[PDB]
Ligand binder design. Structure first.
Ligand SMILES: Nc1ncnc2c1ncn2[C@@H]1O[C@H](COP(=O)(O)OP(=O)(O)O)[C@@H](O)[C@H]1O
Ligand SMILES: [Mg+2]
Length: 377
């Protein structure tokens, strides 16, 4: 039976299958290969993915995201209490365990983090069945290497709730290394995984000896990601709109959301183009917002965030007791590592060493998990 590899991402989720000697990162029936890790609840329906993300500004308190930051954790955990101040949805305590509380079809309902993630996994399952034309049951699901047993068990539980048979929970940096065949290359191999996603930055140093993976060190920032770079763009354009129209759009949640979406899309374009256009009809009080931004300006807006990603690299190397010259392979993971300045900074830091980046970095985890799922099935 087909077995799939699932990257259950903090902000975006991906599903691949290894067939015929190739990995297919599977598109949904609108052609999109990624599913935002969003679930929403309304008067009439439950919405997953982009359908949930697209109505977040009209339905903020019943639109849930970031379940991966809660999954496997206890309610009184410092990080849970810290994160809850930034979320517009309610997190309640059920007997020590955090639950998200929403209104759903006119009734108050609460869900464990793994139930929320299972709804995202249900969609991934359906996407893969739409592509394969067959029932999909077996899956390998990835987690951050620092996840503990509770978080791993809760992530497996989300798979089970979704109807998946989770063959194995494996680490995201190991999935990435597997995707590049780094366990099949010789002596010990020191591998640095540089994983910059939508909300989190993870650096891992693995050593692979006789095909055995050992996590030597991890570092990073749990609250640094692409959305911070989008944030800097949003603020930049809110200030521009105010300077040009003497109007502050900050308190119109729908306007800011439309600006944010435009900024995220401009950001992606700036990874392959030196400029990007912003085109928003009726952004605020009937005023269109047609403008542009250069790649240089985007880099300037974020210069300290980009440069600072090197400090967790240095720390991970110090903890692994390796010099930078002892790294055999550098692997780029997460959508944010497509940013040319981040690539330049990292390659410069490694004295010109070529990066592993031929696999779309935001897809490399699902790619590796798909390979592992075929091996185990
Ligand atoms: N071409 C691109 N250039 C810059 N950033 C991108 C590009 N493609 C995706 N991203 C960013 O990658 C981040 C999400 O990465 P991903 O690994 O797909 O999600 P997760 O955060 O769940 O790991 C987002 O901030 C997104 O805007
Ligand atoms: Mg990712």
């Amino acid at each position: 039976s087909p077995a799939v590899g699932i990257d259950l991402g903090t902000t975006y989720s991906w599903v691949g299958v290894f067939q015929h000697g190739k990995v297919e990162i599977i598109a949904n029936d609108q052609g999109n290969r990624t599913t935002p890790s969003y679930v929403a609840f309304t008067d009439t329906e439950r919405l997953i993915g982009d359908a949930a993300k697209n109505q977040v500004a009209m339905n903020p308190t019943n639109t849930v995201f970031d379940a991966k930051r809660l999954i496997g954790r206890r309610f009184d955990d410092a990080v849970v209490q810290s994160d809850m101040k930034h979320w517009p949805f309610m997190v309640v305590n059920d007997a020590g365990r955090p639950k998200v509380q929403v209104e759903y079809k006119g009734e108050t309902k609460s869900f464990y983090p793994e139930e929320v993630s299972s709804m995202v996994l249900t969609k991934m399952k359906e996407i893969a069945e739409a592509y394969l034309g067959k029932t999909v049951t077996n899956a390998v699901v990835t987690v951050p290497a620092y996840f503990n047993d509770s978080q791993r068990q809760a992530t497996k539980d989300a798979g089970t709730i979704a109807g998946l048979n989770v063959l194995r929970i494996i680490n995201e940096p190991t999935a990435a290394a597997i995707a590049y065949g780094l366990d099949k290359k010789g002596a010990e191999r020191n591998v640095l995984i540089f994983d910059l996603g939508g909300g989190t930055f993870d650096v891992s140093i693995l050593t692979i000896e006789d095909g055995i993976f050992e996590v030597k060190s991890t570092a990073g920032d749990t609250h640094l990601g692409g959305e911070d770079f989008d944030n800097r763009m949003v603020n930049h354009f809110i200030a521009e709109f105010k300077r040009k129209h003497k109007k502050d759009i900050s308190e119109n949640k729908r306007a800011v959301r439309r600006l944010r979406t435009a900024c995220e899309r401009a950001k992606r374009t700036l990874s392959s183009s030196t400029q990007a256009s912003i085109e928003i009809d009726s952004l605020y009080e009937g005023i269109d917002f047609y403008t542009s931004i250069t790649r240089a300006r985007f880099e300037e807006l974020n210069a300290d965030l980009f440069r600072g990603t090197l400090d967790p690299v240095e720390k991970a190397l110090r903890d692994a007791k390796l010099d930078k010259s002892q790294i055999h392979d550098i692997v780029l993971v997460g959508g944010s590592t497509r940013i040319p300045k981040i690539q330049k900074l990292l390659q410069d830091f490694f004295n010109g060493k070529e990066l592993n980046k031929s696999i779309n970095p935001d897809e490399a985890v699902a790619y590796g998990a798909a390979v592992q799922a075929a091996i185990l099935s």
